[PDB]
Ligand binder design. Structure first.
Ligand SMILES: [Ca+2]
Length: 249
């Protein structure tokens, strides 16, 4: 169920001998109390700390500010459950000791194809700054750089409106986006919204992937999307968001 070795993150845990993916206790520099996390440990001693997982539509991602801050969903020793670790925990891990962390977004198709997109020097700010997302540069990956924004063709400033670097976090009850309306409320989720999005992994789980403007009454593109890999009308089968110290790349 839960393993004995502990550390500051899953890489530290892997550096101490553990070789099995599963549940572990970690305690980041500023964390006053230890908490449970799911570590993904591969054959090369890489230990990834997973903070978000989607795979079957068992959890509703339309949660409020406090829920996204504290975390929701279920942690499993088998890694077959959906959850959001919690913004406060993501903040404590990503900013401890100025250690440079890399974020890996892993996506899976309804056709079996998996893709990734890596971001160097990933960080999540404190609550005072509404858990802002910042990264140095896109490090590569076949899923493409959706965080850089995308020109959908709706408005000439589309790219400026869809980038995510520097965006604060938003939930329906705590709007901090760059939109006149409420992106989080219209979509029904919690995310780093701009004048909405180009990459949005906390959207509605549409079975089969393909959906349309007709699926929803207002026709919102509120699925689990990553514009640089698939159309805004295609919802992902599985997603994984995980972090590891930059030097492990
Ligand atoms: Ca707004």
């Amino acid at each position: 169920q839960i393993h004995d070795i502990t550390g500051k993150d899953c890489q530290d845990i892997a550096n101490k001998g553990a070789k099995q993916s599963g549940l572990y206790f970690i305690k980041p520099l500023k964390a006053n109390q230890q908490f449970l996390v799911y570590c993904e440990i591969d054959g090369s001693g890489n230990g990834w700390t997973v903070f978000q997982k989607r795979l079957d539509g068992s959890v509703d991602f339309k949660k409020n500010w406090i829920q996204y801050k504290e975390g929701f969903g279920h942690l499993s020793p088998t890694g077959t459950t959906e959850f959001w670790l919690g913004n406060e925990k993501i903040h404590l891990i990503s900013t401890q000791s100025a250690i440079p962390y890399a974020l890996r977004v892993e996506l899976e198709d309804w056709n079996g194809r998996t893709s990734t997109a890596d971001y160097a020097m990933f960080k999540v700010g404190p609550e005072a700054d509404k858990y802002r997302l910042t990264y140095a540069y896109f490090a590569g990956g076949d899923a493409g750089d959706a965080f850089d924004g995308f020109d959908f063709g709706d408005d000439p400033s589309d790219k400026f409106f869809t980038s995510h670097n520097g965006m604060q976090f938003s939930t329906w009850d705590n709007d901090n986006d760059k939109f006149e309306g409420n992106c989080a409320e219209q979509d029904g989720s919690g995310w780093w919204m701009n004048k909405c999005h180009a990459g949005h992994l906390n959207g509605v789980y549409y079975q089969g992937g393909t959906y349309s403007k007709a699926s929803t009454p207002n026709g919102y593109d509120n699925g689990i999307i990553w514009a640089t890999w698939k159309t805004r009308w295609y919802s992902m089968k599985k997603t994984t968001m995980k972090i590891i110290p930059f030097n492990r790349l």
